[PDB]
Amino acid sequence: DAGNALVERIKGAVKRTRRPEVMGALCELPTKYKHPVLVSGTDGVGTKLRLALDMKKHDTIGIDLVAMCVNDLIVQGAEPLFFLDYYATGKLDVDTAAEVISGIADGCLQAGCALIGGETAEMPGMYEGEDYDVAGFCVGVVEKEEIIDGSKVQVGDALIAVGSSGPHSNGYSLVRKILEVSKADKNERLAGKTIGEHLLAPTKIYIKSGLKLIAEHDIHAISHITGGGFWENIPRVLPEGTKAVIDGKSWEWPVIFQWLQEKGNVTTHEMYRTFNCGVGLIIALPKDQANAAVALLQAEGETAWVIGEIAAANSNEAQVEIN
Amino acid sequence: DAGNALVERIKGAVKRTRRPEVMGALCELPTKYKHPVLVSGTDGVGTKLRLALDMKKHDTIGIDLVAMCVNDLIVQGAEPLFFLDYYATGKLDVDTAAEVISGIADGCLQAGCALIGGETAEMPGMYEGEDYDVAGFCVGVVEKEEIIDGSKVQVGDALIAVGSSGPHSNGYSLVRKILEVSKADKNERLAGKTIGEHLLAPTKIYIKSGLKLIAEHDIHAISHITGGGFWENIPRVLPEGTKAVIDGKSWEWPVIFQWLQEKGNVTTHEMYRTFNCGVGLIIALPKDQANAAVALLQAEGETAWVIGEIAAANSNEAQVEIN
Ligand SMILES: Nc1ncnc2c1ncn2[C@@H]1O[C@H](COP(=O)(O)O)[C@@H](O)[C@H]1O
Numbered sequence: 322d323a324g325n326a327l328v329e330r331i332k333g334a335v336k337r338t339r340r341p342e343v344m345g346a347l348c349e350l351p352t353k354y355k356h357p358v359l360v361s362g363t364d365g366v367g368t369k370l371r372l373a374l375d376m377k378k379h380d381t382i383g384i385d386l387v388a389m390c391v392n393d394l395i396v397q398g399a400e401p402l403f404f405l406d407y408y409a410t411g412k413l414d415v416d417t418a419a420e421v422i423s424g425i426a427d428g429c430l431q432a433g434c435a436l437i438g439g440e441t442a443e444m445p446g447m448y449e450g451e452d453y454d455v456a457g458f459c460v461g462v463v464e465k466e467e468i469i470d471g472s473k474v475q476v477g478d479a480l481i482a483v484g485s486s487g488p489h490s491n492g493y494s495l496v497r498k499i500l501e502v503s504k505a506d507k508n509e510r511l512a513g514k515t516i517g518e519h520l521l522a523p524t525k526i527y528i529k530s531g532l533k534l535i536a537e538h539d540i541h542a543i544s545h546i547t548g549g550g551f552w553e554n555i556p557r558v559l560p561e562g563t564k565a566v567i568d569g570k571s572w573e574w575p576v577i578f579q580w581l582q583e584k585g586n587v588t589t590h591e592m593y594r595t596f597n598c599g600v601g602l603i604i605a606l607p608k609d610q611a612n613a614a615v616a617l618l619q620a621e622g623e624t625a626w627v628i629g630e631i632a633a634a635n636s637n638e639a640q641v642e643i644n
Numbered sequence: 645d646a647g648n649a650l651v652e653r654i655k656g657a658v659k660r661t662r663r664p665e666v667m668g669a670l671c672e673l674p675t676k677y678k679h680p681v682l683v684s685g686t687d688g689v690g691t692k693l694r695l696a697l698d699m700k701k702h703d704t705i706g707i708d709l710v711a712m713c714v715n716d717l718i719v720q721g722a723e724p725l726f727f728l729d730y731y732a733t734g735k736l737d738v739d740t741a742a743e744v745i746s747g748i749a750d751g752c753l754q755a756g757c758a759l760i761g762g763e764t765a766e767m768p769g770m771y772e773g774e775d776y777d778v779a780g781f782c783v784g785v786v787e788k789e790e791i792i793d794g795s796k797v798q799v800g801d802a803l804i805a806v807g808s809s810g811p812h813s814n815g816y817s818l819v820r821k822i823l824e825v826s827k828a829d830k831n832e833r834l835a836g837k838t839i840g841e842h843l844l845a846p847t848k849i850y851i852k853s854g855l856k857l858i859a860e861h862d863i864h865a866i867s868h869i870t871g872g873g874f875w876e877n878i879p880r881v882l883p884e885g886t887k888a889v890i891d892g893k894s895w896e897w898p899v900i901f902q903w904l905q906e907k908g909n910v911t912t913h914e915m916y917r918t919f920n921c922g923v924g925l926i927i928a929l930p931k932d933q934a935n936a937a938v939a940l941l942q943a944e945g946e947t948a949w950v951i952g953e954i955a956a957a958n959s960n961e962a963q964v965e966i967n
């Protein structure tokens with residue numbers, strides 16, 4: 322009965338996401354692939370969900386869920402194809418679940434994948450109050466010969482940054498600690514939006530721009546900047562014996578990160594190892610294609626810029642250097 | 645560090661499940677398919693997990709997780725290909741998580757799918773004590789022309805039952821209520837095993853036998869008996885205007901169900917609408933193939949029998965009739 326109200330309630334959102342490969346959860350492979358390989362992953366949104374629960378605002382958290390999954394697929398060159406979610410809760414609140422699922426559908430549309438199935442589970446005793454937990458699962462497709470595996474990254478490659486929408490879905494344990502110690506007023510305005518708005522802003526989805534970029538340029542590696550922040554994730558594009566030399570003149574941290582550091586008495590050292598600091602993706606490619614790639618990304622709605630280059634590194638040194 | 649102990653700890657279990665299609669989470673389609681269609685699903689284990697947590701016994705619950713997912717795929721004719729899990733907890737207990745994941749690997753091997761990825765998430769504040777929640781996701785493959793869609797079911801078809809291992813992963817809310825009201829001693833012996841053992845017995849996986857059966861016989865429909873028990877799930881094989889006429893002489897409920905009914909003061913009416921009552925799958929096929937199908941299922945390690953037939957039904961009547 323509750324799950325019946327919900328099923329009817331979301332069928333619109335689900336149908337919105339349908340792509341022609343979907344049959345009748347059945348899905349054909351897109352016809353363009355000659356040697357398709359499936360690329361899959363699962364993710365949750367983490368402590369960001371705790372903030373959404375604190376704020377009782379559930380309409381965008383599904384976008385973060387889809388984003389986490391799909392932005393990890395694009396790093397290998399995969400085109401998202403379909404998506405499923407598992408939603409667990411103590412007592413099913415149909416409005417809440419419908420809001421979450423609708424935001425999942427919003428994300429799926431921006432990622433170009435169909436929401437084809439899912440599960441809503443009641444686990445009384447496991448979740449307190451109005452809490453729920455949601456897991457996402459995505460399957461994408463890549464042409465076998467075109468997998469981006471990082472083998473092509475060279476010393477001398479340029480590094481492009483693609484701008485983030487805010488903290489995305491990482492660092493939210495520190496966010497919540499900052500908010501609780503400072504007893505922060507989430508209604509405070511900063512640059513025309515409330516602090517709560519800035520912090521719940523959904524993760525940017527990089528599929529439309531990413532797929533176009535990969536099609537038009539020689540992309541050597543991509544890193545999706547997630548747990549461990551800017552500092553930990555940049556090295557995923559680096560061969561052994563190299564470093565990312567970051568041009569510190571090339572961007573300013575988005576103001577929400579500056580606010581978090583000030584409000585929270587946080588070191589820059591910790592900030593860089595927790596938050597994306599404005600960088601959602603970093604891309605390695607030849608220097609002579611970097612400006613064209615940047616223009617393409619911008620044309621597809623991203624913020625993008627040349628943030629650095631890959632240099633030879635000695636045995637001792639840090640793999641990320643800001644200068 | 646905790647997630648590092650765990651990753652090393654499970655890599656053996658994961659490698660055990662590898663199939664040749666896995667590359668390097670990357671997976672090719674099996675070569676035999678001419679027009680492959682992907683079939684996918686997500687599931688959790690439900691309140692059975694609460695029993696495993698009550699009993700602090702985590703080594704088989706992953707089998708139930710895989711079983712729930714894969715036994716739903718086989719109903720459409722799909723061959724499980726790969727599997728991913730999302731494990732969420734308040735504080736990561738590496739031994740617990742490793743036990744769960746190893747049991748997932750056990751299930752994957754029996755289902756013939758590779759465990760190719762997953763996520764372990766810490767959500768402090770969301771889960772109390774040692775609680776965790778685990779979601780499963782599976783992708784299988786079916787030849788487009790060979791999808792089992794139920795269109796072939798006929799009045800006059802035989803119905804075969806495939807025996808369950810116990811309650812599988814459904815009815816465990818009622819199980820726990822029975823145990824709590826009766827203050828049942830889970831160490832009590834029944835037919836050579838403890839009550840706790842009977843109730844945690846992992847769900848039977850029907851892939852090896854199922855795939856062979858579909859290959860060798862004209863299977864019209866299959867229903868995996870899950871939520872709502874024997875009574876609610878049998879009608880999934882039925883066209884409009886038909887009923888399942890069940891031969892009540894053809895089996896005896898496994899003793900654990902009789903124990904649950906007696907201990908719990910439960911009506912037969914409720915039992916049939918909650919538990920599988922010994923039937924894990926029901927299969928519709930031509931009568932002239934039923935005996936051969938039964939022998940095949942038995943040769944592949946199942947318990948199986950002809951449990952009834954599909955008859956014409958009048959407007960008013962129940963779709964399941966035991967006589
Ligand atoms: N949270 C969800 N997201 C997407 N689809 C769902 C969700 N919950 C249920 N469904 C779909 O609705 C139908 C009934 O769901 P269930 O029997 O609970 O898995 C199935 O086809 C599901 O795939």
Ligand SMILES: Nc1ncnc2c1ncn2[C@@H]1O[C@H](COP(=O)(O)O)[C@@H](O)[C@H]1O
Nearest residue numbers: 651729730731745759760761762763764
């Ligand atoms: N519960 C799990 N089951 C299977 N694989 C996992 C699990 N947790 C982590 N992994 C794998 O271990 C690596 C590190 O995990 P993570 O970065 O937490 O997703 C990834 O390749 C995961 O796919």
